[PDB]
Write an enzyme that holds these catalytic residues in place. Structure first.
Site, PDB file in Angstrom:
ATOM      1  N   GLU A  42       0.815  -1.208   0.000  1.00  0.00           N
ATOM      2  CA  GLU A  42       0.000   0.000   0.000  1.00  0.00           C
ATOM      3  C   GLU A  42       0.856   1.269   0.000  1.00  0.00           C
ATOM      4  O   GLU A  42       0.523   2.231  -0.668  1.00  0.00           O
ATOM      5  CB  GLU A  42      -0.952   0.039   1.192  1.00  0.00           C
ATOM      6  CG  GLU A  42      -2.108  -0.920   1.101  1.00  0.00           C
ATOM      7  CD  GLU A  42      -3.072  -0.599  -0.042  1.00  0.00           C
ATOM      8  OE1 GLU A  42      -3.232   0.593  -0.425  1.00  0.00           O
ATOM      9  OE2 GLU A  42      -3.679  -1.561  -0.548  1.00  0.00           O
ATOM     10  N   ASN A  71       1.519   4.242  -3.634  1.00  0.00           N
ATOM     11  CA  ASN A  71       1.513   5.704  -3.711  1.00  0.00           C
ATOM     12  C   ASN A  71       2.793   6.305  -4.274  1.00  0.00           C
ATOM     13  O   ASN A  71       2.757   7.343  -4.946  1.00  0.00           O
ATOM     14  CB  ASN A  71       1.202   6.300  -2.343  1.00  0.00           C
ATOM     15  CG  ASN A  71      -0.186   5.923  -1.847  1.00  0.00           C
ATOM     16  OD1 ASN A  71      -0.352   5.473  -0.715  1.00  0.00           O
ATOM     17  ND2 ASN A  71      -1.187   6.120  -2.691  1.00  0.00           N
ATOM     18  N   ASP A 101      10.926   7.550  -1.851  1.00  0.00           N
ATOM     19  CA  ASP A 101      10.975   7.867  -3.268  1.00  0.00           C
ATOM     20  C   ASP A 101      11.691   9.200  -3.452  1.00  0.00           C
ATOM     21  O   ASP A 101      11.971   9.897  -2.462  1.00  0.00           O
ATOM     22  CB  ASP A 101       9.564   7.834  -3.922  1.00  0.00           C
ATOM     23  CG  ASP A 101       8.672   8.974  -3.474  1.00  0.00           C
ATOM     24  OD1 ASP A 101       9.150  10.111  -3.426  1.00  0.00           O
ATOM     25  OD2 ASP A 101       7.471   8.740  -3.186  1.00  0.00           O
ATOM     26  N   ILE A 125      -3.801  13.623   4.366  1.00  0.00           N
ATOM     27  CA  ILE A 125      -3.530  12.432   3.566  1.00  0.00           C
ATOM     28  C   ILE A 125      -3.272  11.184   4.436  1.00  0.00           C
ATOM     29  O   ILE A 125      -3.719  10.089   4.107  1.00  0.00           O
ATOM     30  CB  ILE A 125      -2.359  12.667   2.614  1.00  0.00           C
ATOM     31  CG1 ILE A 125      -2.761  13.717   1.557  1.00  0.00           C
ATOM     32  CG2 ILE A 125      -1.931  11.353   1.987  1.00  0.00           C
ATOM     33  CD1 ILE A 125      -1.594  14.330   0.787  1.00  0.00           C
ATOM     34  N   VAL A 157      -7.095  10.505   6.734  1.00  0.00           N
ATOM     35  CA  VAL A 157      -8.447  10.449   6.166  1.00  0.00           C
ATOM     36  C   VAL A 157      -8.606   9.236   5.259  1.00  0.00           C
ATOM     37  O   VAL A 157      -7.706   8.917   4.473  1.00  0.00           O
ATOM     38  CB  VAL A 157      -8.776  11.779   5.418  1.00  0.00           C
ATOM     39  CG1 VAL A 157     -10.089  11.694   4.627  1.00  0.00           C
ATOM     40  CG2 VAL A 157      -8.820  12.942   6.421  1.00  0.00           C
ATOM     41  N   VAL A 176      -6.560   0.633  -0.693  1.00  0.00           N
ATOM     42  CA  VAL A 176      -7.193   1.114   0.543  1.00  0.00           C
ATOM     43  C   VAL A 176      -6.576   2.422   1.071  1.00  0.00           C
ATOM     44  O   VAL A 176      -7.270   3.204   1.711  1.00  0.00           O
ATOM     45  CB  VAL A 176      -7.236   0.028   1.676  1.00  0.00           C
ATOM     46  CG1 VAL A 176      -8.163  -1.129   1.282  1.00  0.00           C
ATOM     47  CG2 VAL A 176      -5.842  -0.494   2.025  1.00  0.00           C
ATOM     48  N   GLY A 177      -5.288   2.651   0.800  1.00  0.00           N
ATOM     49  CA  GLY A 177      -4.637   3.935   1.103  1.00  0.00           C
ATOM     50  C   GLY A 177      -3.753   3.939   2.342  1.00  0.00           C
ATOM     51  O   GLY A 177      -3.964   3.116   3.234  1.00  0.00           O
ATOM     52  N   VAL A 178      -2.789   4.871   2.416  1.00  0.00           N
ATOM     53  CA  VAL A 178      -1.883   4.938   3.594  1.00  0.00           C
ATOM     54  C   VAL A 178      -2.572   5.161   4.919  1.00  0.00           C
ATOM     55  O   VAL A 178      -2.027   4.793   5.945  1.00  0.00           O
ATOM     56  CB  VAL A 178      -0.797   6.067   3.574  1.00  0.00           C
ATOM     57  CG1 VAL A 178       0.551   5.552   3.152  1.00  0.00           C
ATOM     58  CG2 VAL A 178      -1.241   7.324   2.844  1.00  0.00           C
ATOM     59  N   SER A 179      -3.730   5.813   4.917  1.00  0.00           N
ATOM     60  CA  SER A 179      -4.406   6.078   6.178  1.00  0.00           C
ATOM     61  C   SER A 179      -4.709   4.766   6.894  1.00  0.00           C
ATOM     62  O   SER A 179      -4.699   4.716   8.115  1.00  0.00           O
ATOM     63  CB  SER A 179      -5.688   6.886   5.974  1.00  0.00           C
ATOM     64  OG  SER A 179      -6.486   6.294   4.970  1.00  0.00           O
TER      65      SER A 179
HETATM   66  C1  LIG Z   1       7.112   6.427   0.192  1.00  0.00           C
HETATM   67  C2  LIG Z   1       5.662   6.710  -0.184  1.00  0.00           C
HETATM   68  N1  LIG Z   1       5.651   7.726  -1.224  1.00  0.00           N
HETATM   69  C3  LIG Z   1       4.657   8.566  -1.505  1.00  0.00           C
HETATM   70  O1  LIG Z   1       3.589   8.518  -0.885  1.00  0.00           O
HETATM   71  N2  LIG Z   1       4.901   9.443  -2.492  1.00  0.00           N
HETATM   72  C4  LIG Z   1       4.144  10.538  -2.751  1.00  0.00           C
HETATM   73  C5  LIG Z   1       2.754  10.575  -2.525  1.00  0.00           C
HETATM   74  C6  LIG Z   1       2.037  11.741  -2.830  1.00  0.00           C
HETATM   75  C7  LIG Z   1       0.649  11.839  -2.611  1.00  0.00           C
HETATM   76  C8  LIG Z   1      -0.180  10.745  -2.005  1.00  0.00           C
HETATM   77  C9  LIG Z   1       0.308  10.045  -0.884  1.00  0.00           C
HETATM   78  C10 LIG Z   1      -0.481   9.051  -0.297  1.00  0.00           C
HETATM   79  N3  LIG Z   1      -1.726   8.798  -0.763  1.00  0.00           N
HETATM   80  C11 LIG Z   1      -2.233   9.474  -1.813  1.00  0.00           C
HETATM   81  C12 LIG Z   1      -1.482  10.471  -2.453  1.00  0.00           C
HETATM   82  C13 LIG Z   1      -0.010  13.033  -2.942  1.00  0.00           C
HETATM   83  C14 LIG Z   1       0.685  14.125  -3.471  1.00  0.00           C
HETATM   84  C15 LIG Z   1       2.066  14.048  -3.683  1.00  0.00           C
HETATM   85  N4  LIG Z   1       2.782  15.108  -4.180  1.00  0.00           N
HETATM   86  C16 LIG Z   1       2.319  16.227  -4.829  1.00  0.00           C
HETATM   87  C17 LIG Z   1       1.342  16.146  -5.826  1.00  0.00           C
HETATM   88  C18 LIG Z   1       0.917  17.309  -6.472  1.00  0.00           C
HETATM   89  C19 LIG Z   1       1.478  18.536  -6.117  1.00  0.00           C
HETATM   90  N5  LIG Z   1       2.427  18.584  -5.162  1.00  0.00           N
HETATM   91  C20 LIG Z   1       2.853  17.475  -4.523  1.00  0.00           C
HETATM   92  C21 LIG Z   1       2.726  12.839  -3.378  1.00  0.00           C
HETATM   93  C22 LIG Z   1       4.113  12.733  -3.581  1.00  0.00           C
HETATM   94  N6  LIG Z   1       4.768  11.607  -3.283  1.00  0.00           N
END
Ligand SMILES: CCNC(=O)Nc1cc2c(-c3ccncc3)ccc(Nc3cccnc3)c2cn1
Length: 191
Positions: A33, A37, A64, A85, A88, A90-93
């Site tokens: 999970e 992401n 990453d 994030i 809230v 299945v997702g990191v939550s």
């Molecule tokens: C090691 C895990 N890496 C990770 O979650 N990378 C990640 C996730 C972003 C998310 C996100 C995280 C968890 N669930 C849903 C979405 C959303 C937005 C990000 N970055 C972002 C997107 C748009 C504008 N600015 C930043 C993320 C970047 N890296």
């Protein structure tokens, strides 16, 4: 109030969300999970490398080199984007809810930002813990020993097998697996 409701419901019926909690399948799904992401961030064209590390303290981290989870705050609410994030539904939550402890570290806009959670509850606000020119996101979690039984430790082979698939199902993505317990390491990438 609404958040602590959703995280209780995950904690109450974890099999529903993560898979079986007594045979290792749900335990390892926790890792996939978090990885999913990072994969999405790579597919948006922003991340080139994902690193999954099995530590010797019963935690796994996923890193990453993407844009970093957003760190902005709602002025009138206080609560950071990162926190929303992570909490809230299945997702990191879900991973957060079923983690005894979870650590989020974000490199973004010249700063390192950190937040700690216990069973999905933020222990303090997202805070600056340094400066950097790198960007990206690091999630490290220690699985709840109230939720998971029988298989409570991460198994390299299970991770290696699914990380390899994930790399060929989203080709061009580099995924490294490191086990700090014994020094074993793999690099998965396909062209
Ligand atoms: C090691 C895990 N890496 C990770 O979650 N990378 C990640 C996730 C972003 C998310 C996100 C995280 C968890 N669930 C849903 C979405 C959303 C937005 C990000 N970055 C972002 C997107 C748009 C504008 N600015 C930043 C993320 C970047 N890296």
């Amino acid at each position: 109030i609404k958040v602590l409701k959703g995280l209780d419901a995950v904690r109450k019926r974890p099999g529903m969300y993560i898979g079986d909690t007594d045979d290792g399948t749900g335990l390892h799904h926790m890792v996939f999970e978090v990885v999913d992401n990072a994969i999405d961030e790579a597919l948006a064209g922003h991340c080139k490398e994902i690193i999954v590390t099995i530590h010797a303290d019963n935690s796994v981290s996923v890193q990453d080199d993407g844009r970093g989870i957003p760190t902005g705050i709602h002025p009138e609410e206080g609560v950071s984007a990162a926190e929303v994030i992570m909490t809230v539904l299945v997702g990191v939550s879900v991973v957060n809810a079923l983690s005894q402890k979870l650590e989020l570290v974000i490199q973004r806009e010249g700063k390192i930002h950190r937040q700690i959670y216990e069973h999905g509850v933020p222990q303090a606000p997202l805070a600056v813990t340094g400066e950097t020119e790198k960007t990206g996101t690091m999630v490290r979690f220690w699985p709840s020993l109230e939720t998971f039984t029988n298989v409570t430790e991460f198994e390299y082979e299970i991770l290696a097998k699914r990380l390899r698939e994930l790399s060929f199902l989203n080709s061009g993505v580099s995924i490294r697996l490191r086990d700090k317990r014994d020094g074993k390491e793999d690099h998965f990438h396909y062209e």
